[model samples]
Target chain A: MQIFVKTLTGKTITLEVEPSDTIENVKAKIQDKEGIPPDQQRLIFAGRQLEDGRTLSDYNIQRESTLHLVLRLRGG
Target chain B: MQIFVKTLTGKTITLEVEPSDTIENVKAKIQDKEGIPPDQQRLIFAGKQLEDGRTLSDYNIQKESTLHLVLRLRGG
Candidate 1:
């Protein structure tokens, strides 16, 4: 399935993913697109922040999901 | 239902519509909110691009599914 990631800075990036993919897995891709480290990504969906360990399927969500991305405050 | 489409800014739009609402209808809302012309508007769901006539149901688009307005660069 494909997912859309939206950033606070007026950015939207599309990601190709699978149900087996974990939030942590997606964070890495977000890193590739936004330069936000996987460790620094706070992914929220439907107003709930996603945890790193759960698979996408665990949420009972369908395809074409959009994730709201927030940057976790930290120094580089 | 209402769909969310994120702009290049923090001004994401929530458009009112039914399952029968076409991409064109949604773009009209974007134009209403962001003032982007329908012809220039590009909506992306998951990774699927939304063309003018297709309805939300045509793609099985769910509620609160955020659409992305892709930045189509002028040229190389």
Candidate 2:
């Protein structure tokens, strides 16, 4: 499936993913393309934070739907 | 417009907001309902981090749509 990611900066990035893929897998793809490490990525869908171990299917992430990422804040 | 906010804990809080309301205003409402301070809220819509000064209309947040809030990280 093809989905889009909305970054904190409001830039959109498209990625190929699968319902079987875990959120960690999606984050890995984001890392590959965006140079953001997986640990620093947080994905949200429909107001729900995507847990690392949950598959996209578990979250009902549909194709062409978008995910939002707010990079991990640091030095709080 | 009515919208929902998903907290990092996966709980949803419903809010009545106007498109003309600033994100700061929205945060204030969350603080009122959730006992969380406005400065401790980080809101995301469609992958974009909602800026304090930006209006919900500016972000095109629709009625009944949802927002994600990742509480500020502490002691990191």
Candidate 3:
């Protein structure tokens, strides 16, 4: 399955993965391509954080579905 | 001065303000327009958090400058 990941700066990166791929796995790929560390990456779908332990299928993320990615900022 | 504020979802809102306007004031305006609230709103410029106490001039925010807005996610 393919999904579209969009950064805060409006850059979009496409990723191909199985439906069973975890959010952590996707973050790793994003880290590889976008240079955003996994710990610093916050993936949001439908206004909620995508849990690392959950599968893409669990969140109903499908091909062409967009995930909003934001870098974690320090401090409150 | 007019500034461009881009949301994580790629929605851009143009805001007109004085150079002395603080980040807290901007967030309040965004809360009014986008209903995201000030507490959950995290304004980023140059990969750094725009402190509420600081004025736009303090950060050198200028006309057409872009501020990235991200919602703070709960949990780890």
Candidate 4:
């Protein structure tokens, strides 16, 4: 199925993702697309952290779903 | 009128606000409530910056509307 990944820079990329893919997988995909490191990436959905082990389906996400991936800065 | 301020940590604060209130005003309120610095505050509405001069009315935000205030970090 296809899902849309939206970046902080306002770019959106559609990827053919599998139901078996975890949120971490999506993070890797985003990292690959944006050249952002995994540790510096933070993805939020409906106002919460996208935990590593949970699948998009686990979050009741669907095909054609769009998720927000914010490139996090370092210490404040 | 009253407005709801939702923090990044999932806390909600209800404050009485006026129509003349700008997004910057809301940031001040959030900072007062959360003890976060004004510069550290980043308020997002509908996936965009809450520009300094725009009022809640400008963004179509209602009296009871809830907004997100993210405490930004330093350089990455």
* lDDT (Cα, tens digit) per residue for candidate 1, span A7-53: 65557889988988988998987788768788656676764567789
* Predictions' DockQ, in order: 0.02, 0.16, 0.21, 0.10
lDDT of 4 by residue, A1-76 (tens): 9988775457788777888789888878877876768776666666555777889888887989777665543321
**Ten contiguous residues with the weakest lDDT in model 2 chain A:** A67-76
Off by over 4 Å in 4: B1-28, B31-76
Which CAPRI level is candidate 2?
Answer: incorrect
Write model 4 residue lDDT over B3-67, tens digit each, in one string: 87665556788888887888778778867876766776666656444667777887788868776
TM-score of chain A of each: 0.86, 0.93, 0.90, 0.82
Candidate 3 per-residue C-alpha lDDT over B1-76 given as tens digits, one digit per residue, 9 for 90 to 100: 7899976566899988878998899999887887877888778786555766888888788998999776766521
Model 4's CAPRI class? incorrect
True contacts kept of each: 0.00, 0.18, 0.11, 0.03
- Candidate 1, residues B12-66: lDDT per residue as tens digits? 7788778988889888877788777777755666543466688889888878888
Question: Distance (Å) between predicted and true CA of A41, model 4?
Answer: 1.4
Clashes of each: 1, 0, 0, 0
Per-residue error for B59 in candidate 2, Å, reads: 20
Q: Pick the winner on DockQ between candidates 1 and 3.
A: 3
Question: On a 0 to 100 scale, what is the lDDT of residue B74 in model 1?
Answer: 27
* Candidate 1 positional error at B72, Å: 35
Give candidate 4's error at residue B27 in angstroms.
8.0
Question: Against the unseen true structure, what C-alpha lDDT does each candidate score?
Answer: 0.72, 0.81, 0.81, 0.70
Count of clashing pairs, candidate 1 = 1
* Candidate 2 lDDT tens digits, A1-76: 9999986556899999988999999999999998998887878787556789989999889899888788764421
- As a whole number from 0 to 100, the lDDT of residue A16 in candidate 1 is 88
